[PDB]
């Protein structure tokens, strides 16, 4: 139903468009509403549209640098959020209400990473972490290293190995640069028997590294 | 904007209630509250809107009331999924500015201590020749999140060259933590070997790798 554009890093006094698809189904024709959350904060709404009217509304806090604007062309909203401050670092959603059964619900997009920084954007380096001594049962897996800004989204087979997987939390390094890791438990007999694949996706840097893991 | 206390705690089948207090020109002004249930790294679920509906198929766990200034989620037969942070929600009377509350971080209590499953990886093959060595110390699913972590060089504390995530709210409720030992490919092989302890109350797991 709803799907947005990717994370990007701006300049500490830039803009940044994050664009809202309404891809669903329906007859509710309710506003999009935009409400962002700072990574361990709450959430603040930020304002919405109202698509017919084209009638935008937008809390104070934000009036003046945000300017939200729907293209009824294709169905796809915009929050343009400026003069971009440190504090602006947060995932931005978008949400919108619904009838579902005589009674209320509400979509939420997957929100969208938008870091403000004055550092480069760097694609990863994938190493592969071979299996085998220190792992009935084996661990093999990936080190997404060095990038910036996030996320990283690490998936196997392509997506087929959908099991077992483990994808920790990127850890920040003093350099300000990101690192994370990706493993896998996987049965020790499969290992000789089976291609193991970890397809790495940094889409602020339009690169997905495929790297292949084995032993000796 | 809408204050809610900071934080709830409950044992299983319990139930407690959530309490969001606003003004006269918000909560106070109409029927326009609702809440909000997020677990960890995911987006909210709308649990209550206007003041006691529930949309459909939440729940009936979750009850809403509204009084005066301020609005009530309740939450009985207290399981241990229900463990996450709750908002709530208002919109003034035109639906034309909406504003949240802080936010109440609810926690189920007696839930079962879990040690730290650990893994350490040593530098690739790939890495070192690329003249890097990073050590990787992959903490797994335990409770509560009280682990803290330090490395060894042979058997004496390389601390600092490190660095260490913060527990992290699995789905399954535990928790999970990374950390990473940086160092020159040569410190790595000029060493017997290093090691990652991981103590985490009363167990202290950990675990050594070698050139
Ligand atoms: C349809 C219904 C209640 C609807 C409440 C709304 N509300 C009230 C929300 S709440 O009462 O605080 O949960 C809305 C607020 C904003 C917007 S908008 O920004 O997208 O235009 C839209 C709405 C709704 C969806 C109109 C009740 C039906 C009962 C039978």
């Known amino acids: 139903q709803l799907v947005q554009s990717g994370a990007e890093v701006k300049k500490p006094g830039s803009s940044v468009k994050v664009s809202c698809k309404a891809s669903?189904?329906?007859?509710?024709?309710?506003?999009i509403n935009w409400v962002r959350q700072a990574p361990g904060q709450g959430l603040e709404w930020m304002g919405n549209?109202?698509?017919?009217?084209?009638?935008?509304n937008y809390a104070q806090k934000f009036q003046g640098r945000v300017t939200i604007t729907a293209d009824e062309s294709t169905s796809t909203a915009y929050m343009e959020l400026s003069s971009l401050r440190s504090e602006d670092t947060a995932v931005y959603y978008c949400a919108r209400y619904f009838m579902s059964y005589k009674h209320l619900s509400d979509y939420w997009g997957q929100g969208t990473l938008v870091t403000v920084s004055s550092a480069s954007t760097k694609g990863p380096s994938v190493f592969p972490l071979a299996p085998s001594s220190k792992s009935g049962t084996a661990a093999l897996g990936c080190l997404v290293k060095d990038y910036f800004p996030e996320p990283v989204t690490v998936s196997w087979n392509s997506g087929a190995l959908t099991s077992g997987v483990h994808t920790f939390p990127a850890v920040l390094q003093s350099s300000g640069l990101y690192s994370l890791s990706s493993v896998v438990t996987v049965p020790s007999s499969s290992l000789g028997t089976q291609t193991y694949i970890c397809n790495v996706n940094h889409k602020p840097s339009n690169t997905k590294v495929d790297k292949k893991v084995e032993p000796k | 904007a809408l204050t809610q206390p900071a934080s709830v705690s409950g044992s299983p089948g319990q139930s407690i209630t959530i309490s969001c207090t606003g003004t006269?020109?918000?909560?106070?002004?109409?029927?326009?509250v609702s809440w909000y249930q997020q677990h960890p790294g995911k987006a909210p679920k709308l649990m209550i809107y206007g003041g006691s509906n529930r949309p459909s198929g939440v729940s009936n766990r979750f009850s809403g009331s509204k009084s005066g200034n301020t609005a009530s989620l309740t939450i009985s037969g207290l399981q241990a999924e229900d463990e996450a942070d709750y908002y709530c929600?208002?919109?003034?009377?035109?639906?034309?500015?909406?504003?949240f509350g802080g936010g109440t971080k609810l926690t189920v209590l007696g839930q079962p201590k879990a040690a730290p499953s650990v893994t350490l990886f040593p530098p690739s093959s790939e890495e070192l020749q690329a003249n890097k060595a990073t050590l990787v110390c992959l903490i797994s699913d335990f409770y509560p999140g009280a682990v803290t972590v330090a490395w060894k060089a042979d058997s004496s504390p390389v601390k600092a060259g490190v660095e260490t995530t913060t527990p992290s709210k699995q789905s399954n409720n535990k928790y999970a933590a990374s950390s990473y030992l940086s160092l020159t490919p040569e410190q790595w092989k000029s060493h017997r070997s290093y090691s990652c302890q991981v103590t985490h109350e009363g167990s202290t797991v950990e675990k050594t790798v070698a050139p």
């Open positions: 006269s020109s918000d909560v106070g002004s109409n029927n326009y």
């Open positions: 549209i109202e698509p017919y009217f084209g009638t935008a």
């Open positions: 669903g189904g329906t007859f509710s024709n309710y506003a």
């Open positions: 929600r208002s919109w003034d009377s035109n639906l034309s500015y909406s504003v």
